[PDB]
Write the C-alpha cells for this entry.
Amino acid sequence: LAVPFLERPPMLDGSYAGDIGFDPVGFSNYFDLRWLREAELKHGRVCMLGVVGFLVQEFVTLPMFSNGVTPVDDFFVVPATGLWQIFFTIGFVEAFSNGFKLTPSDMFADDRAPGDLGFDPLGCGKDPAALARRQLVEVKNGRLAMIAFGGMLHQQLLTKQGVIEQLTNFKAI
Amino acid sequence: MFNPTTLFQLIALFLVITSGPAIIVLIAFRRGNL
Amino acid sequence: MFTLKIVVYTTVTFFVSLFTFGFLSNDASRNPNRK
Amino acid sequence: KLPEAYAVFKPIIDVAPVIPVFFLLLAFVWQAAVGFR
Amino acid sequence: EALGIDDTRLIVPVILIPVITFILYAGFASEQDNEDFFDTYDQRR
Amino acid sequence: RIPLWLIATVGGTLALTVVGIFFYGSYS
Amino acid sequence: MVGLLQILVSILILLSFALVVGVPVILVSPGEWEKSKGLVYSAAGLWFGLVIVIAAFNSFV
Amino acid sequence: IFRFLLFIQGFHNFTLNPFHMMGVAGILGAALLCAIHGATVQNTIFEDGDAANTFRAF
Amino acid sequence: VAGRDIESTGFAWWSGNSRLINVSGKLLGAHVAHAGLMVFWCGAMTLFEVAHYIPEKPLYEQGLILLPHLAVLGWGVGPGGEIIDIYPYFVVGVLHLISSAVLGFGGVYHSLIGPDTLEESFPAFGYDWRDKNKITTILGIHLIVLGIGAFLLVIKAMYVGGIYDTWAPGGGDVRIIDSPTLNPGVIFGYVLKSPWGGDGWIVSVNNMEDLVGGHIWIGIICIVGGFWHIFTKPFAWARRAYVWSGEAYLSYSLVAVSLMGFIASQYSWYNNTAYPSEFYGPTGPEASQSQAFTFLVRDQRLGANVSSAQGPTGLGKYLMRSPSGEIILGGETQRFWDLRAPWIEPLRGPNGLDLNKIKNDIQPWQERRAAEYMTHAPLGSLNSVGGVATEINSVNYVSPRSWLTCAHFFLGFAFYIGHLWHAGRARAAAAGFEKGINRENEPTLSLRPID
Ligand code: CLA
Ligand code: CLA
Ligand code: KC2
Ligand SMILES: CC1=C(C#C/C(C)=C/C=C/C(C)=C/C=C/C=C(C)/C=C/C=C(\C)C#CC2=C(C)C[C@@H](O)CC2(C)C)C(C)(C)C[C@H](O)C1
Ligand SMILES: CC1=CCCC(C)(C)[C@H]1/C=C/C(C)=C/C=C/C(C)=C/C=C/C=C(C)/C=C/C=C(C)/C=C/C1=C(C)CCCC1(C)C
Ligand SMILES: CC1=CCCC(C)(C)[C@H]1/C=C/C(C)=C/C=C/C(C)=C/C=C/C=C(C)/C=C/C=C(C)/C=C/C1=C(C)CCCC1(C)C
Ligand SMILES: CC1=CCCC(C)(C)[C@H]1/C=C/C(C)=C/C=C/C(C)=C/C=C/C=C(C)/C=C/C=C(C)/C=C/C1=C(C)CCCC1(C)C
Ligand SMILES: CC1=CCCC(C)(C)[C@H]1/C=C/C(C)=C/C=C/C(C)=C/C=C/C=C(C)/C=C/C=C(C)/C=C/C1=C(C)CCCC1(C)C
Ligand SMILES: [Fe+2]
C-alpha cells in the first residue's frame, strides 16, 4: 500500500498495472477508472515522447527550420502555419484510433482495454505475461516521464539552457 | 460588352442564384421530405 | 438645491422600489385564468 | 485589393456577401414549393 | 460620480427605501409556498 | 401545366432584374 | 506557386458547389443517408484535405 | 408635390392656417383610429379555434 | 407530414418557426444554420472589403466597417493608424468562410435528419423549457463561453501582439497593454456613471487600460456566474418573478440585445478609443471641433487675435467660455466641448485649451489629423452624397460611423419591438389566453361594472 495511514481506495482492486492503492484524493471514485487509465497512459506516452524530443532538439535540428535557444523556444521559431498541421494531424489520429468516439459517454462502448488503440505494428505484445510486464513498465515509465517533462520544460524556461547543457553548466538562479 | 471580369461575375451570380432552387427541384424530383 | 435633490431622489427611489418589488410579487399569477 | 494568388477570384467574392438574402428568398421559395402548408 | 451622488447624505434614502419595500415584500414572500413547480408560471399565491 | 411556384419564382427574378437594370441606369 | 494555387482553389470551389447542391439533395431523399453517408463523409474529407493543401501552398513554397 | 408643399409654406405660411391644423388633426386622428381599432379588434377576439394563428377561426 | 403544417401545429407558414419551440433538435439545427449564416457574412464581407480596399485612401473613405474592427486589434496596422498589410484581414475572412461551411453543414444536418427531440436520444442535450435547472445549466455553459471570448480579447491585447491604442504618444500605435485597470472602483464607476452629456456612461472609456481591465472583470464575472448557474437552480423569488417558457427566454434575450444595439450605436457615434478615428473616421463632435481648431490655427498663425475677437452676439467667435468655466472652442461647436481626441489632448490644459500650448506645442501630426478630420464630417445621404442635404451630386461619402450607428439604432428599436411582442405573447400563452377570449367564461363579464 502506497499510503499506509489511509485505507485502500475502494475502486483500486489491482487489476490495472501499477496499482498500489495510491488515490488519497479519491479520483477512482466518482469517475470512470477506464477513462482515468487511458488518460494516464496518454499523458505518459505524450510526455514519454516529449522527453526524447527535448533531448534530440538540442543537438539535432531539421534542415527546414532554424534552431532556437531552447527546445521550449523551438516552438516559437517555427512558423504558425505547419504548427496547425501538427494539431490537425493529431486530431485525425485521435479521431481514427478512438473510433470517432471522443467523450466519456460513448467511449468504451465495446469495453476495449484503456489505452489500447490497436497499435502493435511490430507484434511485441503477444505473450500475456510479457504483456503484463510491459504494461507495468510502460505505466511506470510514463509516471516517471511526465514528472521529468514537467521538470525539464520549466528548467529550460527559467535558465534559458538545454537540459544536457544545464547539467554540464550547473549554476544557481 | 464582353469583359472577363463581368463574365465571371455573371457566371458566379448565375451559379449562386440557381444553386438553391436546384436543391429544391432535385429534392422534389427524388420525392424527398420537402 | 440639495434639499430638492434629496427629495427627488427619495421620491424616485420610492416609486422605483414599488415598481420593482411589485413585479417581483408573482405578477404572472395575477390573471383571470389562475386556478 | 486581394493577394495576387487569389485576385482572379474577385467576382465570386463580390457575389458572396448578398447570399444570406438568397437564403431568405430560398426559405420563401421552399414554402412556395410545398404550397404554404 | 456613481448614480449622480456627490453628497453622502443622498445614499441614505436610495439604500433605505428599497430596504423597507423589501421588508414588506419579504413578509409577502414568507407567506408563500416557496417550493419548486413544473409549469410556465406559478399559480399559487 | 407548369406548377405555379416556378412561374412565381421566374416572375420575381425578372422583376428584380428590371429593378436592378433601373438602379444601374440610375447609377449610370 | 501561382496558377497551381488557382487550380487548387478552383477545384475547391467546384467541390464546394457539388457539396452545397448535392448534400441536401442526397440527404433529404428517401434512403441514401445511411446508404451514402460514407460517400458524403469521404467528399467532406476531400474538401478538408483540399483546404489544408491550399493552406500549406499559400506560403508559395 | 414636395415643391408645392414648401412653396405654399413659404408664400402662405399654411402650417399656421387653422383649417390646415384641423386637416392635420383629422388625418392623424384617422390614422390613430385605424391603428387603435385594428389593435383592439385583433386583441379582443374570441377563442373560436384551437390553432394558435387565429385568422382561420372566422 | 405532421409537425410541419397548420393542421398539426396550429401555426401558419409565416409563423412556422414557432413550430420549433418544442422540437429541440430541429431548433438546434436552426440555431447552428443561423450561426453559419452569421459567420458566412463575416467572412464574405471581410473578403469583399479586402478586395475593394484602395491602399491610398483611409478605411473610412472607402465604406469599410469590418476592416476597422481588425485594425483596432492591431492586425496589419503601423504607427499612426497606417494600414501596412491586409493579409491578416484575408486570413480572418477565409477562416470565417471555412468555419461557416462547417456550421452550415451542422445546421442542415440537425435541421433535416438529426433527431427532432433530443430528450430521448441524447438526454444530456435534451431539455424542457419549464425545467429551470437544465436551462440554467445551458445558460451557465454559454456564460463561460462568453467569458472565454472576453479572455481571448484580453490575451490578444496583453500578450499576442497587442491592440491599437489611439492615445499612444506620437499619434497612436499598436501597443501591448501591460498594466490593465483592475481597480473595481474605476470599472464599476464607469457602469454607475450618468449616460448624459459630459459623462457618457460606458461610452466614455478613453484609454485601453480601462478597457482591458474591465474585460478581465467581465471574463471573471461571466465564468463565475456560469459555474454558479451550472451548479444552482433559480431561487424562489426568481421562480415567482419570471415566466418559464422558450418564448419568455427569447423575449428576455431580445430586450437585452436591443439594449446592446442601442449601446453599440452610441459607441460608434461618440467613442473614439475603441472606435479610433484613424479607421472609423472622426465623430460629429470630432469633425466640428476639427474645423474650429483648424480655423483657430489658421487665424493664430496668419495674424488674427482669436481670444479677443467678439462674435456676432458678443460671445467668443473662436475661443469662448464653457458653462463650467473652461476655455473651449467658440461658435456653434460649443455644444461639443466634451470631445476628447488624441490630436487635441496634448494641447489642452486643466482650464481647457491652453493658448500658450496652442501657439507653441503643436506637433505636425496633430495638424495633419485636424486637417483630415474637418472635411469628412459624418453628414451624408441614403444615395451616398457627401455634405449637407443642400449639396450637389459630386461628393460620394457617408461616414462608417453614421452607417453603424443608424443600423444598430434601427435594430435596437426593432428588437425592443420584438421583446414587447414576445413578452406579451409569452405571458398570454403561459396564462392561457393567447388564442383569444373564452366565450364560456369571459373575465370581463364576471366583473362588476366600473362606473
Ligand atoms: C435563418 C433562417 C431559417 C432557418 C435556419 C430555418 C430552419 C428551419 N425551418 Mg424555417 N423559415 C424561415 C427561416 C428559417 N428556417 C423563414 C424566413 C420562414 C418563412 C417563409 C420559415 C418558415 C418555415 C415553416 C413554415 C416551417 C419551417 C421549418 C423549419 C425547420 C425544418 C425545415 C425543413 O423541414 O426543411 C425542409 C427544406 C428542404 C428540404 C429544402 C432546403 C434544403 C437546404 C436546407 C437548403 C440550404 C442548403 C445549403 C445551401 C447547403 C449547405 C450544405 C453544407 C454542407 C454547406 C428548420 C429548423 C419547419 C418546422 O418547423 O419543422 C418542424 C416548418 O414547418 N420554416
Ligand atoms: C432572435 C430574434 C428572434 C427570434 C428567434 C424570433 C422568433 C420568432 N418570432 Mg419574432 N420578432 C423579432 C425577433 C425574433 N423572433 C423581432 C426583432 C421582431 C420585431 C420586428 C419580431 C416580431 C415578431 C412577430 C410580429 C411575430 C414573431 C413570430 C415569431 C415566431 C415565428 C417566426 C417565424 O416563423 O418567422 C417567419 C419569418 C418570416 C415570415 C419572414 C418575414 C420577413 C419580414 C417581413 C421582413 C420585414 C421586417 C420589417 C422590415 C421590420 C419592421 C420594422 C420594425 C421596426 C418593426 C418565432 C418564435 C410570430 C409568432 O407567431 O410568434 C410566436 C409573429 O407573429 N416575431
Ligand atoms: C503533422 C505532420 C505533418 C503532416 C502530416 C503534414 C502534411 C503535409 C502535406 C500532405 C501530404 C503536404 C503537401 C505538406 C506540405 C507542406 N507542409 Mg506539412 N505536414 C506536417 C508537418 C509540417 C510542418 C511542421 C511544417 C509543414 C509545412 C509545410 C509546407 C511549407 C509551406 C511553406 O514553406 O510555407 C508545405 C508545402 C511548413 C509550414 O507550413 O510552414 C512553413 C512547416 O513548418 N508541414 N504537409
Ligand atoms: C517512477 C514512478 C514513480 C515515481 C516517481 C517520481 C520520480 C516522482 C518524482 C516527483 C518529483 C521529484 C517531483 C518534483 C517536484 C518539484 C517541484 C514541485 C518544484 C517546484 C518549484 C517551484 C514551484 C518553484 C519555484 C520557484 C520559481 C521557479 C520562481 C522563483 O521566484 C521561486 C522559486 C525558485 C521557488 C512512483 C514512485 C510514483 C511509482 C510509479 O509506479 C512510477
Ligand atoms: C505523489 C508523489 C510520488 C512520490 C514522490 C513524491 C513524494 C515527491 C510525491 C510528489 C510528486 C510531485 C510533486 C509531482 C509534481 C508534478 C508537476 C508539478 C507536474 C507539472 C508539469 C507541468 C507541465 C507538464 C507544463 C507543460 C507546458 C507545456 C507542455 C507548454 C508550454 C508552452 C509552449 C512552449 C507552447 C505555447 C504555450 C506554452 C504554455 C508557452
Ligand atoms: C460564394 C461561395 C464561395 C465559393 C464556393 C461556394 C460554392 C461555396 C460559393 C457559394 C456559397 C453559398 C452558400 C451559396 C448559396 C446560395 C443560395 C442559398 C441560393 C438560393 C437563392 C434563392 C432564390 C434565388 C429565390 C428567389 C425567389 C424569388 C425571387 C421569389 C420568391 C417568392 C415566391 C416564389 C413565393 C412568394 C413569395 C416570393 C418572395 C414572391
Ligand atoms: C480558400 C479560398 C481562397 C481565396 C478564394 C476563396 C475566397 C474562394 C476561398 C474559398 C473558400 C470556400 C470554397 C469556402 C466554402 C464555403 C461554404 C461551403 C459556405 C456555405 C455554408 C453553408 C451555409 C452557411 C448554410 C446553412 C443552411 C441554412 C442557413 C438553411 C436554412 C433553412 C433550412 C434549414 C430549412 C428551409 C429554410 C432555410 C432558410 C433554407
Ligand atoms: C468599464 C467599461 C469600459 C469599456 C469596456 C468594458 C467592458 C471594460 C466596460 C464595462 C465593464 C463592466 C463591469 C460592465 C458591467 C455591466 C453590467 C453589470 C450590466 C448589468 C445590467 C443589469 C440589468 C440590465 C438588469 C435587468 C433586470 C431587471 C431590470 C429586472 C428584472 C425583474 C426583477 C429582478 C425586478 C421586477 C421586474 C423583473 C422583470 C421581474
Ligand atoms: Fe369592427
Observations:
- Residues 16 and 24 of chain D are 15 Å apart (CA to CA).
